[PDB]
From Swiss-Prot:
<dbReference type="GO" id="GO:0043066">
    <property type="term" value="P:negative regulation of apoptotic process"/>
</dbReference>
<dbReference type="InterPro" id="IPR046371">
    <property type="entry name" value="Bcl-2_BH1-3"/>
</dbReference>
<keyword id="KW-0053">Apoptosis</keyword>
<feature type="short sequence motif" description="BH2">
    <location>
        <begin position="132"/>
        <end position="147"/>
    </location>
</feature>
<dbReference type="GO" id="GO:0008053">
    <property type="term" value="P:mitochondrial fusion"/>
</dbReference>
<dbReference type="Pfam" id="PF00452">
    <property type="entry name" value="Bcl-2"/>
</dbReference>
<dbReference type="InterPro" id="IPR020717">
    <property type="entry name" value="Bcl2_BH1_motif_CS"/>
</dbReference>
<comment type="subunit">
    <text>Interacts directly with BAK1, BID, BMF and BBC3. Interacts directly with BCL2L11/BIM. Interacts with BAX isoform Sigma. Interacts directly with PMAIP1. Interacts with RTL10/BOP. Interacts with ING4. Interacts with UBQLN4.</text>
</comment>
<dbReference type="InterPro" id="IPR013282">
    <property type="entry name" value="Bcl2A1"/>
</dbReference>
<dbReference type="GO" id="GO:0005737">
    <property type="term" value="C:cytoplasm"/>
</dbReference>
<dbReference type="InterPro" id="IPR020726">
    <property type="entry name" value="Bcl2_BH2_motif_CS"/>
</dbReference>
<dbReference type="InterPro" id="IPR036834">
    <property type="entry name" value="Bcl-2-like_sf"/>
</dbReference>
<dbReference type="InterPro" id="IPR026298">
    <property type="entry name" value="Bcl-2_fam"/>
</dbReference>
<dbReference type="GO" id="GO:0043065">
    <property type="term" value="P:positive regulation of apoptotic process"/>
</dbReference>
<keyword id="KW-0963">Cytoplasm</keyword>
<dbReference type="GO" id="GO:0015267">
    <property type="term" value="F:channel activity"/>
</dbReference>
<comment type="function">
    <text>Retards apoptosis induced by IL-3 deprivation. May function in the response of hemopoietic cells to external signals and in maintaining endothelial survival during infection. Can inhibit apoptosis induced by serum starvation in the mammary epithelial cell line HC11.</text>
</comment>
Length: 151
């Protein structure tokens, strides 16, 4: 239902993970909303990775649990001043992209059925901590897309 509920947000986090992993699904392709988010979130992830080269080469992400704990430290720090904006929501997807790259390279017991887990808790955080703001600011089609679509 609607674009601020779990299903829509899970589909966005899923698409972003398939983009980072280089495994887009075959079948009509992603939505306009997803295509704009992928382009802008990836540009941010590239910057975050450069800006944290030492910090990222220190932690090891061997499991879904460890990735959730690391994502929790990030979200707490990112929103420690209490303010929500589109740039910070874009930053959530950039961090899920970095976490799935480290999990693919460091998951002690690999499992291709664990990218869906990361997407799940990312959508869980977005809906429970930013879902009200998103809907009150136009949602994804009249909020996110209008602000970040090509001019
Ligand atoms: C450098 C390790 C550290 O303290 N972490 C843990 C960490 C490392 C790698 C990933 Cl990916 C996820 C978590 C850490 C690093 C950055 C954090 O923050 C971000 C930078 C500022 C804020 N906007 C997000 C939080 C924790």
């Amino acid at each position: 239902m609607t674009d601020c509920e779990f299903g829509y947000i899970y589909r966005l986090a899923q698409d972003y993970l398939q983009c980072v992993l280089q495994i887009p699904q075959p079948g009509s392709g992603p939505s306009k909303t997803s295509r704009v988010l992928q382009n802008v979130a990836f540009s941010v992830q590239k910057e975050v990775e450069k800006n944290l080269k030492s910090c990222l080469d220190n932690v090891n992400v061997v499991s879904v649990d460890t990735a959730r704990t690391l994502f929790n430290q990030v979200m707490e720090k990112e929103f420690e001043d209490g303010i929500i904006n589109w740039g910070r929501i874009v930053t959530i997807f950039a961090f899920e992209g970095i976490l799935i790259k480290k999990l693919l390279r460091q998951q002690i017991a690999p499992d291709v059925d664990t990218y869906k887990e990361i997407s799940y808790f990312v959508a869980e955080f977005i809906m429970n901590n930013t879902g009200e703001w998103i809907r009150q600011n136009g949602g994804w089609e009249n909020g996110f897309v209008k602000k970040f679509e090509p001019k």
